[PDB]
Every structure is written in C-alpha cells, then in structure tokens.
Design a binder for this molecule. Structure first.
Ligand code: HEM
Ligand SMILES: *[C@@H]1O[C@H](CO)[C@@H](O)[C@H](O)[C@H]1NC(C)=O
Length: 439
C-alpha cells in the first residue's frame, strides 16, 4: 500500500511539532453556512502529512487540522456509524470509566456541546493568532467558539520537555505504507492501527472514513511543586551503584516513576544514573524492550509510565494492536522558585494531550484502563506492579518496586495530573472534509 500523504491530516501521522499550538473548540450554529465556508477553507489551510514532511521552505507559517465530535457530525447531517464503541457517547460519558474525578471537569467539556476542534500549530504567537483570526473571519457566525486552549513548548533547554521536567515525544510507532526513518527499538505497525479503513484496522468503517483517525484529547492540569516535593520526601536512599544524596535520590525516584530520566535516557538502558547524551540520541534512546527485566525491578519498575503505556516484551513479543501516535503540548508558565519552595501549585500549567488511533478502545483507552489503572498489569510478575504513578487513576494509588533495592516496598502516590476535560474526535481525510462533510 502507498498512503496518500497529501490526503491525510498531518498531525495524525507526522505531528505538527510546533512550539505553539491552539485548540479551538466550537459548536456549529448553521450547518449550511459552515459547509460553504469549509469548502473554501480546507484547500487553503488544512495541512497534510505531505506538507509536514516537506522542507520548511515549502511550509505555511502555521498548520491547521480539524476534527469533529459525534454531536458535530450529527449537527452536520453526517449520520453513518463510524464503528467506534466510545466515539458516539463522547468522553464525558466515558470519564468515570477512565477513573476521572468528575468534580474536576469543567465547561464546556461537561456534556457534548462541543462539535469539533481546529488545531493550529505554529512556531510563533503572531502566526498562531493570525491563523486563529482567519478561522473566526472565514466561518463567522456559522460557528461559536466555546473554548480555546493554547499551549507552548517550554523555554531554552527545556524545549520538548513537559512541566515535570521530562523530555517527551521520543517513542512513537512507525506505520508501513510510506517512506520513513525507523529508529532502533521503534515499533513498526500496519497503517490501520492509526488510520481508519487501512490494513490493521478491524473496525467497521464507512468508505468515506478512509484515512481518518480518532483523537483522544485530554486537558491535564499538572501539580509540579507537589510532584517535586513528593520525590524529595521519598528520595531513594541508594541504588546498585551506591548511596545517593537526597537530590540524586529524588531525581532517581522521578525517573523510576516515568521509566526515563528527564534527559530522555530510558532507565532500562541507564538504570542507576542519567546518561544525557543517550537521552538526546534517537539512535539509542528507544533501543530497549524490557527483555532484560521481565521478572525483576532493578532495571525498571513494572509500573513505570512508559512501561505501562507501551509494555514491549512484557506482552511476550511485538503486538501491533495497542500502539498510538501522540502530539501533546505543554501549557502554562514555568514553575517559579517560590512555588517549588512552597511545594504548592499557584499557577495553572499542564499538558494538552493528544493521542491518535483507529480504535479508541485499543489505544488511549486500553493504555489507560487495561494497563495504567490495572494494579495487576503487566501480568505474571513476581511483585504486584500497582497503579501507574503519573496517570493511573485507581485509588489507592499504590505502586510497587520504585526502590530497586527494596522492591517489595510500596509507594502511595498523590495524584499530580488532574483531568479537567477532554473529548473524542474524528479527523477525516482531507478529501472527506470537502466531498463528504461539506457536501
Ligand atoms: C500530563 C500527563 C502526561 C505526562 C506528563 C506524560 C509524559 C510522558 C513522558 C515524559 C514520556 C516519555 C517520552 C516518550 O517516550 O515519548 C511519555 C511516554 C508515553 N506516554 Fe505519556 N504522559 C502523560 C499522559 C499520558 C497518557 C494519559 C497516556 C495514555 C493513556 C500516555 C501514553 C504514553 C505513551 C504511549 C508513551 C510512549 C511509550 C513508549 O512507546 O515507550 N501518556 N509520556
Ligand atoms: C551508605 O549509606 C549508609 C546509610 O544508609 C551509610 O551507613 C554508609 O556509610 C554509606 N556508604 C558510604 C561509605 O558512602
């Protein structure tokens, strides 16, 4: 198969990888007028995977992608069942299943009023704002913006790191069907794991849904001073290499919780001390599979974030089904010295989380419920793994094995990641936007 890269919305396959991003959540007021605007908007602004892989000289100053919720499709008279079990009811109706404290959800996510989302990516505020204004001007009164959430990469040497300090966006699946660089340790999967209607997708899709994908969007607020204080209060006293200072033990505990050091070095490869050069090297930073630590936790806890969300050899071999693409971006200001010293969050910051898959229940939702929330996953281990400490949502939030020298010790971890809302969207192919959605 040859994927039509010019017809696939770029954030799905390639990722915008821009320094700034805005999510404009909207409701449709006038379906006919919306469709009329869409037919002029799409060819001019919707950015394909082909554009994202081209030289920067051939790229627009901002990229735009567009997804619809179930109620958005219904509002537009797009009534065919897309074949996904969770998409029709929306994420609010699924939130309790995910383990969410519903009291922390906020409008306009607390229902199914949201009809869709424009994602705008750009390396600069000015261009982000101009392309946002272009949407407002093009669509006019045919839509109402019900929320805009804006994110930004962190500054300086923290570019690409999320707010707890950890380098993000290292490990992504690679799909067959196009010409791409594959790094050592990177999963290679059929395109239908990500793209609806392609090989590997087992969902029952309308023909017009070919080369779309489902987005799980999550708005997470992060509690950074609290996370930092917890690592200091529970600093690991020693590892195989020797005794740790409190600061070293706190850094190590953070790395044990994630499965990677802040630099990106995976603990399976660097189990006792950071290796920043390894973290920065994509030829090496993903080249592990837990095969050296299937039945012990010295090299990596069973319940570390990355191991829970991608179990690699814990599954007994390569498995296509549960991989997904991520295109998340941090939001909010840096954490001040005063904030860190107090140990108490004073500003709103976090992650605008974006995960793409053909089957919501096999990607985001499987990683969340079957794996992260599941105290007995990974299976068949000599010590109960417990709840994933970063995003696991089962109480008590108890995780074992964080101390490599006392693996039976359990850690009860306060929740540092608060879901504030989210939605399930479908991003059609570019042709489907104008030939089906706007018909
Ligand atoms: C604020 C919340 C979150 C933060 C701060 C966070 C942070 C990170 C970091 C630092 C990494 C390691 C870098 C990498 O491998 O790319 C990572 C990996 C990953 N995360 Fe998260 N994450 C969050 C939420 C989630 C959620 C909710 C899920 C899914 C339910 C998820 C799924 C994944 C996956 C699939 C990987 C790659 C694993 C691999 O292939 O080895 N993350 N995340
Ligand atoms: C390692 O730490 C222990 C206390 O936990 C201490 O007794 C020992 O002297 C330390 N080792 C050295 C010599 O650094």
């Amino acid at each position: 198969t040859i994927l039509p890269l010019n017809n696939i919305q770029g954030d799905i396959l390639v990722g915008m990888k821009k320094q700034k991003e805005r999510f404009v959540f909207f409701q449709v007021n006038d379906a006919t007028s919306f469709k009329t605007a869409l037919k002029t908007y799409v060819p001019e602004r919707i950015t394909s995977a082909a554009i994202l892989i081209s030289d920067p000289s051939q790229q627009p100053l901002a990229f735009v992608n567009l997804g619809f919720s179930n109620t958005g499709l219904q509002a537009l008279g797009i009534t065919d069942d897309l074949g996904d079990a969770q998409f029709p009811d929306g994420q609010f109706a699924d939130a309790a299943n995910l383990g969410d404290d519903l009291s922390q959800w906020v409008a306009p996510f607390t229902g199914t009023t949201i009809h869709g989302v424009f994602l705008i990516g750009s390396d600069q505020d000015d261009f982000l704002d101009q392309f946002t204004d272009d949407i407002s001007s093009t669509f006019g009164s045919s839509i109402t913006q019900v929320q805009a959430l804006s994110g930004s990469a962190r500054p300086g040497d923290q570019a690409g790191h999320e707010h707890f300090g950890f380098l993000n966006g290292i490990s992504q699946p690679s799909v067959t069907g196009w010409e791409t660089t594959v790094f050592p340790g990177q999963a290679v999967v059929p395109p239908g794991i990500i793209l609806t209607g392609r090989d590997g997708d087992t969902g029952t899709r309308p023909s017009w849904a070919l080369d779309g994908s489902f987005m799980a969007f999550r708005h997470f607020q992060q509690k950074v001073p609290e996370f930092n204080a917890y690592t200091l209060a529970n600093a690991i006293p020693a590892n195989s290499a020797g005794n740790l200072t409190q600061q070293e033990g706190a850094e190590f505990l953070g790395a044990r919780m994630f499965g990677r050091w802040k630099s990106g070095a995976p603990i399976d490869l660097a189990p006792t001390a950071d290796d920043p050069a390894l973290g920065a090297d994509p030829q090496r930073n993903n080249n592990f599979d837990y095969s050296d630590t299937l039945t012990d936790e010295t090299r990596c806890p069973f319940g570390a974030h990355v191991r829970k969300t991608n179990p690699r050899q814990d599954l007994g071999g390569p498995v296509d089904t549960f991989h997904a693409m991520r295109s998340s971006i941090p939001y909010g200001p840096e954490t001040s010295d005063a904030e860190l010293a107090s140990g108490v969050t004073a500003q709103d910051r976090g992650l605008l989380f974006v995960e793409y898959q053909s089957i919501i229940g096999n990607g985001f939702r499987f990683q969340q419920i079957n794996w992260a929330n599941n105290a007995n996953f990974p299976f068949s281990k000599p010590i109960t793994p417990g709840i994933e400490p970063i995003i696991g949502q089962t109480t008590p939030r108890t995780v074992g094995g964080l101390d490599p020298l006392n693996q039976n010790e359990t850690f009860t971890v306060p929740l540092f990641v608060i879901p504030k809302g989210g939605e399930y969207f479908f991003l059609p192919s570019i042709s489907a936007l104008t030939a089906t959605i706007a018909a």
